[PDB]
Structure formats: structure tokens, C-alpha cells
Design a protein around this ligand. Structure first.
Ligand code: AU
Ligand code: AU
Lengths: 196, 196
């Protein structure tokens, strides 16, 4: 961990740089999630998440963004699911999922820009980020805001081919193979605490 | 032809019923090809398969009666709100967890309390009348399960290439041949039903 990616603070900083550079980040909590900036995620990165991830690809958003899109919570942090109103076909391909993410996060996006339900799963982050709730959703948003992006990111859980969820060592190995950075939620909490 | 390889249309349906009764999957084409399995026989390894080469949005096709029995609202005013087995799982995302959730939902005597919401399994409520009412993969699934002698509950997932594109028709055939699945089209099924 320390050997592969550096001290906690270095892991954080390294993760911001990777994000800004267009690389992904593995975020570990048991469960490691591949994460990317919603604004820059590519089609290829989407394809990788479907292939190596659970395929339940989530769009982490803020409450403001949720309100702006008029997306209710699924049950009285998943909201109701979405699909781009324009520019997609079945909504399932990597390209279509990207199209939907881009539509949701666009500046000036309106509710009508999205149909519901759909194949992209928004997650509303708790205000306060990881200082409030140590979830991958929060970590995603914190990482994006610290990196300098809009506070919206895409995440997916890393899954082994046999269907078991990747363990730390597998997550390290995958990050290495894919030139992603890797950081833990505790690291992030620590970092924010320090720079308070 | 590639499709004739599987027989004539009615042969294709019958072969599909045979494959299902044997616990094998069926590739249902409409291009979008979905892998399907009876919910009663689907295994962990089949589930791992669906996550690895499918979209990872693995759906449980159910009837309105079953949706009512589980007290599952539609997600929006055919997806219902998502589900998780209330017992027997952890994060809900692994292949074993998803299969656990499927089995919980379909059990004889299943109760709403047997599932938590939201979750990582996506029930889809089939239109009454099946493919004669709506030629969707959801209806196709339910029709095939019923015709095969199972409970009207099956699991489906769209076949995706590693590069994120949805499998094309010939790609679906290749995958079916590789995994010993039967192959049929929604049209074949419609025709079969109309005949009978
Ligand atoms: Au991990
Ligand atoms: Au298989």
C-alpha cells in the first residue's frame, strides 16, 4: 500500500494528479471502486468499468445537481435511474452511458434532458463528503472537487472474473496494470482533516 | 446461415425450451442479444458470466402478481425499485450476493420483508400477455420460462463486447455456441405463440 502508492497524503495528491491527467483512481474502503471525472471520462474508460467492474456504473452528484435535474430519491444514495433524452439508442453501450453522464452534468442541464428510468445510476453524496459519510460516493465527490473539477464523478466496483469482489491486492494489481492511482477513504478523511 | 444453424424458427423456440429445462442459458436476439436463465436454476457461475460479459445490469423478470407479492413499486410514476436479499448477503454486488437476492425474490412464500431496497438486482415487471402484448426481452424471458415449465421468473442481461459496444448478431451467435446456449429471436417467439 505504502510500497505501491506512497504515504496517505501522497496517495491523495497522487490521486488528484491522475484525475487531472485523465487516468482513473482506485478508491478503497473489502471494496475497491474505479473512479473517473464525469466531465472527462472516456468511452474506453466506460468500457473498462463494464468489463472489469460490476457494470452498475454510478454517477455521483451533489444535492444541488439532483435538485436541478429533478431527480427524486429512488426510495423514500440512489436516485431514480436515468437515460439521455437525446443521442442514445438502448442506453446500455459504453457510448450511450457516457452520453447520459454528459447530459446530466452539463452546465445548464434541465430535467427534460433525461428520461427515467434508465441505465445510469445516480448517487447523491451527503453534504460534507467523507467528513460526513465515509462512502465511496463521498470520496468521489471530494476527490473531484479537490482536483478542480465539477463535483461529479463516476464509480464502479472492481469485480474479479469469477464474480467475487476484488480484494486490496487485486485492486493494487489492477491499478498498476491500468496506470490508475489508488487511495483509501481513510486517507482522504485524514487529508481533509489536516487541511481544514 | 448463422441463424439457421440453430434450426427453423419453431425449432429454435423448442431448442430454447430444451436448453432452459437443462439449466443452460438462451441467447435472445432482437441488434441487442440478451443472455437469459431461469431464475430457479441460474447458478453463481452463470451470474459471474453475466457480469463479466454482459452489461452487468442483471435484471430479474417478474410478473405483476409477483411484484405485488413483494410489495415492489414501479421505480417511476418496466423497472421496479431495486432490491437486495435482506439476509445472506453483504454488499449485494458479488455474483453470489446477486444470486442470493434473486432466489429470495422468487421463493415460494417470498414476503416483502425478505428484501431490502434499493439494491443491486433490478426487477423488471413484464407486460401481461407476454410477447403478444410487447415484443421486449422482458416478455420474451417470461414467455420462455413459462413455456419451459418453470415459474414465470427469469434473469436477463445484454451481451456486451469488451470494447463497450453491444454484441452484434454474429457476436451473439459466437457467444451462444461457446457457452452451450440456445439461440432464438423475439420474432420467432411471437410467431410460435401466434401459431399456438
Ligand atoms: Au480493494
Ligand atoms: Au457459463
Amino acid at each position: 500500500l505504502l510500497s505501491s502508492f506512497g504515504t496517505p497524503f501522497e496517495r491523495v495528491e497522487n490521486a488528484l494528479a491522475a484525475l487531472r491527467e485523465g487516468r482513473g483512481v482506485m478508491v478503497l474502503d473489502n471494496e475497491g471502486d474505479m473512479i473517473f471525472p464525469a466531465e472527462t471520462m472516456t468511452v474506453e474508460q466506460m468500457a473498462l468499468t463494464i468489463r472489469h467492474g460490476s457494470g452498475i456504473v454510478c454517477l455521483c452528484i451533489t444535492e444541488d445537481r439532483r435538485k436541478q435535474l429533478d431527480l427524486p430519491m429512488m426510495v423514500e444514495g440512489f436516485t431514480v435511474t436515468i437515460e439521455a433524452a437525446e443521442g442514445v439508442t438502448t442506453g446500455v453501450s459504453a457510448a450511450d452511458r457516457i452520453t447520459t453522464v454528459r447530459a446530466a452534468i452539463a452546465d445548464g442541464a434541465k430535467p427534460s434532458d433525461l428520461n427515467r428510468p434508465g441505465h445510469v445510476f445516480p448517487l447523491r453524496a451527503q453534504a460534507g463528503g467523507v467528513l460526513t459519510r465515509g462512502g465511496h460516493t463521498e470520496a468521489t465527490i471530494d476527490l473531484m472537487t479537490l482536483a478542480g473539477f465539477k463535483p461529479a464523478g463516476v464509480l464502479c466496483e472492481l469485480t474479479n472474473d469469477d464474480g467475487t469482489m476484488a480484494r486490496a491486492p487485486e485492486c493494487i494489481e489492477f491499478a498498476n496494470k491500468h496506470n490508475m492511482a489508488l487511495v483509501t477513504i481513510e486517507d482522504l478523511v485524514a487529508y481533509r482533516q489536516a487541511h481544514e
